[model samples]
Every structure is written in structure tokens, then in C-alpha cells.
Target: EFVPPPECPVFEPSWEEFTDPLSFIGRIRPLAEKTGICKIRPPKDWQPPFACEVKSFRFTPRVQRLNELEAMTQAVREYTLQSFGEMADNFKSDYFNMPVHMVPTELVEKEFWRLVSSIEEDVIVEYGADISSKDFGSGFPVKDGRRKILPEEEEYALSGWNLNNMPVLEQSVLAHINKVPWLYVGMCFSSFCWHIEDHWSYSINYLHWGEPKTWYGVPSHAAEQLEEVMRELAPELFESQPDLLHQLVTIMNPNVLMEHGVPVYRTNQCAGEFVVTFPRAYHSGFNQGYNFAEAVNFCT
Candidate 1:
């Protein structure tokens, strides 16, 4: 319950204006040097939807087993066929579409079928439980711990079962990638939120396909917002998890009394490029129209 600041800072996206990624990266370098934020488009030939035979299957097997893949493929195929066979013109979610966050894409229609079938089978074996969110488990809520949703809730589903935090499942890739520890594949979805990079870890996000608008603000400025958040939701954050309350406040709520406040950066990314973001800096993005899709690899 952040005391609702006068407004939620808004800015227009400006990355598509450039034709070459180096041009875009050069333009962003100055800002990134100052705030540690940058974006780059991959070379035209970086060609993706990569050879499935290469290492596309480099995921931590904890969440995806052979049986799960088989099942998810079947389920998604059925769902997609049903959707295409229908006659809904210009569709969008009605009532936040609480149940389904993302619809399968038509380009890689087969992948949709595969994932659905795989996830479904995995669900049956695991008592219909969702392994996505469980991929990362903090056992505690996020942010200031202000609003805690049950692990079984739909919100958790949208977050891939907290795959962002689980070391065994989510963090395993960090070890096997055989690159810098900070270099690895990021979450697949385009609209998910991520923290800043000032703390330590950062990402060099590559967008292989679709439009993604990125909103970024310095930790200094975000701390002010967090102050309002802490003051308004102290009880909820504290109550949700007493042990972590103070620590979160200290780490996330930095520069409350600094001379200069945080700076805000905003931009929309194009296909075939990469963008770098700082650790713990607040940022959010939405799909292009509705089918925005992209691939991002994270690295220090």
C-alpha cells in the first residue's frame, strides 16, 4: 500500500529509432555509464529459435522431466487447435483473464502444443501441482513483503512458480552454463518485472523477437517510493515475515536521505538485440500488442 505518490512516473519508449544495435548501444552507453543501464540489438545473423538440437534443452531438469515434455506438448496442441478453430475476432483478456496469463503463439504453434502437453503430464505426476513457480522458492513474498499471495495462488502461477529464486531449479543453470556465473538465460516472458543492477548481478538481455517496453528508475529515486511503501505497509511487510522485514528495508530502501534522487530511464526494445539492466532497480514492461515475445540472456 504505497501511499500512492502523486503519480507513477511514465516515459515514452525510444529504442526502435535506431537501425543498428551498435548505434543503439552507443546511444545508451552514456546513460549506462552513469546509471549502469544499456541496450543492444543482436546481429542480423544471430539467428534464433535456435537449433533445438544444440542446447535449447539446457534447462534445469528439476521442473521439466522427459515425461512432462511429452504431456505438455499434447495439452498445448489441443488448446491451440481449439483456439484457432474458433471465431473470436480481436481477442483480449476479460476481467484480467485471471486463469491464463499468456496465450500460445501461432508462429511457433508446435512449441505451444508441446509445452502444454508437457506441463499437463508433469502436473498429473506431481498431483496437479505447478512446478514453474516452485522452480524458485523464497518461502517469503517479494518486494517489501507488503502483499503476500499463497504459493498456490494464480499470482504465483503468473510468476512461473517463483522460478527466479530456486537455487536447485532456477539457480542450477547458473552453474552449468560454463560461462561467467552471472551469464545465463533469463526468464522467457517479456512482461515480467525485474530488480535493478546496482547491488551486484545484472543482465545483458537479448530480444530475438517482438516488442518490449522497458521502464527503469535509479535506486535513489525508487527508494523514495519504497519509503512511502514501507511507511504505509510496514505492518503487512513486517507481519508477512518478521525476520526479513528490517533487512529488506535496508537493502531496497537505499539513499532515502541522499542529495540526488534516482533517475528514470524508459525505452522500447526491438527484435534481435540485447539490453543490460542493473540489480534491484525497479523496472516493468508490457507486450507489443498482445503477442510480444522475446528471448533474453542474463549476464554480469
Candidate 2:
């Protein structure tokens, strides 16, 4: 009973056009910019090696997103990649009555709205945001300069789109590392609420691997319209957190926004695909399943 918004545009670039990710972005800027977000598929053979093996990866947990599912408790705990994956997979598979891979993303989306609106369902989603500790590093392997030790790492680092390899403008006048790029470990429904990037800069994200991430975006012209809805939803949120981006943020079904006549567009970003959010584009999304993604904020 839901009428989804128009599908966002997607790009399949030639190897040449894909050479410079930013430049390629510029070429398609006009089209995707209007939609606020676009999915970019690199050439068929353009796979890049990821970094820091999962076996030894352990991270302190960040915020947990609770949706209308069957469970969750208020307890803080650290997560190991394997344990997190096992738990995430179990929670999803058990709820859907099918294997994790068997569930349809479209179905997940539909169910999420139904549950959120229901008075008696609760689900939990986890996110690993801003991990920049000693062990924290780009998902893309390093090669061009640091630790020139392995061929695999070097290969991925050579790509122009590599966040670690990109020409990051000195943001001292503005900011630093966490501001440039950060790693995220997201579980199904590990939701990110509607908010523009820091200082309202362009943001590009890469799905290092795993299932698709569902995203909804409102373009620049309508950014304020989207916020007005949020502001009105919880004006008190703006009092302490002027940005309205803390854990106190609330969720609204995209359909509600569309119902309010806000221009909204959406897309599914899968492994190896890229999703870019233009400056002032109010964007939000949820990971469809256990996945790892890397994202960064940058200027034109």
C-alpha cells in the first residue's frame, strides 16, 4: 500500500570516465544532483582489496538503532566482527522466516515502515561510526606511500577514488581526520537519520562489501522543507543539539515526507557501488544487512 518515491539515478561508468572518481562525478553532477543521490558502478573488473582483516578486528560499539522488530535490551557491549555478524544474521533470518540472503530488500523496506507504525514491534540495528583509533584505518588498503608492502594493498590504494589517496583539502580552518573519512560497520536496519553533512559538504560513500544500503534524499532546494518537518516533529531537539543529529533524533517514514509534499528520491547501494550526497542534500538510510562501508565528506 506504499507508493515509493521515484528511483534515484545510477551510473555505470567506462573505465576511462571512472579514472578520476571526482571528475566522473562532475560529469554526471547535474543529473544526480537533482535527485540528491546517485549509485555509481565501477567497471566490471574494478574490484579493490579491503584492509585490516576481520579476524583480529574488534571495535567499541556506537549507537544502536531500535526499529519495530521482535527484540533488544538497553545494554552496552563491545563487538567483534564475527560475533556481530553471527548475531546480526541470526536476528534477521529469524525474523524474516528465511535465510538472510533469501530476504528481499524491498520486502525489508516495506516491513520496516509497517513495524515502525505498529504499536508493538521492536528491532535493533547497530552502527560503527567514526572509528579512528590506532587500529582504525581506511577500508581501502594502503600502498602508494605508506606500508608499501603488498601488491593487493598497493593496487587498491592506486585508485583515484580511494579515500586515503584522495587530495583532502586542509580543513584546519574548518576541521580534520574524522571529518575527512571514517569507517562504518552497519547491521541490517542500522539506521542513519536525516541530516546534511558537516558544514554542508559533499559526501561520497563506498560499500566495501556486503548487502545493499537503502537511502532517501531531499535535494538542496527542498532541504529546508525537509528540516521544517523534523523541526516541527521535535522542536526541543534543536534546543540542545542545534544540528538535530544526536541519538535523540527521531525517524519518519519517507512516505510521510512525500505525503507532506517534500521532494524525496531513493536508491539501493550495493557492494562495490558508490553513493554520493551533494551539499545541502538532506540524506538518510539504513543498511539492509550486515555490511561495511566507508564514507567521507569533501568540497568541490
Q: Please report the candidate that would top TM-score against the real structure.
A: 2
The C-alpha RMSD of each candidate to the native structure, in angstroms, is: 17.0, 3.8
For residues 72-188, write the lDDT of model 2, one tens digit per residue.
215667888788788779878988989999999888888766765565665556677666522645678765343334765566767788776565564574455454477778777
- lDDT tens digits, residues 178-285, model 1? 621121222222123223333344444444333333334444336455444444534443435532344332222122212234444444455544455544545443
Candidate 2 wrongly placed segments (more than 4 Å):
63-73, 144-149, 170-180, 235-241, 244-250
Lowest summed lDDT over 10 consecutive residues: which window, candidate 1? 124-133
TM-score of each candidate structure, all chains considered together: 0.37, 0.88
Model 2, residue 146: distance off in Å is: 7.0
Q: What TM-score would you give candidate 2 relative to the actual structure?
A: 0.88
Q: What overall lDDT, based on C-alpha atoms, would model 1 receive against the true structure?
A: 0.33
lDDT of 2: 0.76
What TM-score does candidate 1 reach? Answer: 0.37
